[PDB]
Enzyme design. Sequence first.
Site, PDB file in Angstrom:
ATOM      1  N   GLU A 193      31.161 -10.541  29.572  1.00 53.95           N
ATOM      2  CA  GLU A 193      31.813  -9.514  30.396  1.00 53.95           C
ATOM      3  C   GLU A 193      31.033  -9.138  31.640  1.00 53.95           C
ATOM      4  O   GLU A 193      31.561  -8.537  32.577  1.00 53.95           O
ATOM      5  CB  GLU A 193      32.026  -8.263  29.533  1.00 53.95           C
ATOM      6  CG  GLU A 193      32.995  -8.498  28.390  1.00 53.95           C
ATOM      7  CD  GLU A 193      34.427  -8.721  28.836  1.00 53.95           C
ATOM      8  OE1 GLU A 193      35.263  -9.127  27.986  1.00 53.95           O
ATOM      9  OE2 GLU A 193      34.736  -8.495  30.047  1.00 53.95           O
TER      10      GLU A 193
ATOM     11  N   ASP B  13      39.250  -6.867  36.854  1.00 51.57           N
ATOM     12  CA  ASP B  13      38.927  -7.898  35.860  1.00 51.57           C
ATOM     13  C   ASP B  13      39.734  -9.166  36.155  1.00 51.57           C
ATOM     14  O   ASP B  13      40.418  -9.237  37.184  1.00 51.57           O
ATOM     15  CB  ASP B  13      39.139  -7.363  34.448  1.00 51.57           C
ATOM     16  CG  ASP B  13      40.580  -7.156  34.009  1.00 51.57           C
ATOM     17  OD1 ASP B  13      40.864  -6.611  32.896  1.00 51.57           O
ATOM     18  OD2 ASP B  13      41.495  -7.527  34.765  1.00 51.57           O
TER      19      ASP B  13
END
Length: 164
Positions: free
Chosen positions: A11, A20
């Site tokens: 991440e 994202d």
Amino acid sequence: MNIFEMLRIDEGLRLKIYKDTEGYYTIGIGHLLTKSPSLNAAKSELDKAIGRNTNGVITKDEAEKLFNQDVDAAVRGILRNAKLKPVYDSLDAVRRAALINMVFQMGETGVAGFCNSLAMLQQKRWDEAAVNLAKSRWYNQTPNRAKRVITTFRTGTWDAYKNL
Ligand SMILES: *SCC1=CC(C)(C)N(O)C1(C)C
């Protein structure tokens, strides 16, 4: 290696609001703020999550705090989910981390839908499970990450994450 280090690699760490892979406002170590396209809505979610007016910026300690909450929530989510708990319980600790990683990325609901793959995992048919996992939007949209998680389920080792 462990689930924290694994998801930290997958991440990243960013201390300002960013989008994202799906275009959604996020911060920290993959903390999704909202799917709304409004930056203001995202900022509101962030201040609520952190407990102060952040103006879109947090500290590394704050990021790690949300991350710990998000990992705990993924796991407890798994254990409350009738489709996920039996597979989870059947797994060794390494493959458990792979399953947590999927849930962190796509939610309990998205992973429960992998019922054919879950059954192969329950059966410890690791190569067959790996082939089936790759037949997915998930693999196509994030193939490098999916390859790492699938390798982890296939081998029950951390080979895809060491040297990284
Ligand atoms: S997604 C839940 C699930 C249904 C069935 C096909 C019976 N399974 O083997 C699992 C637990 C994957």
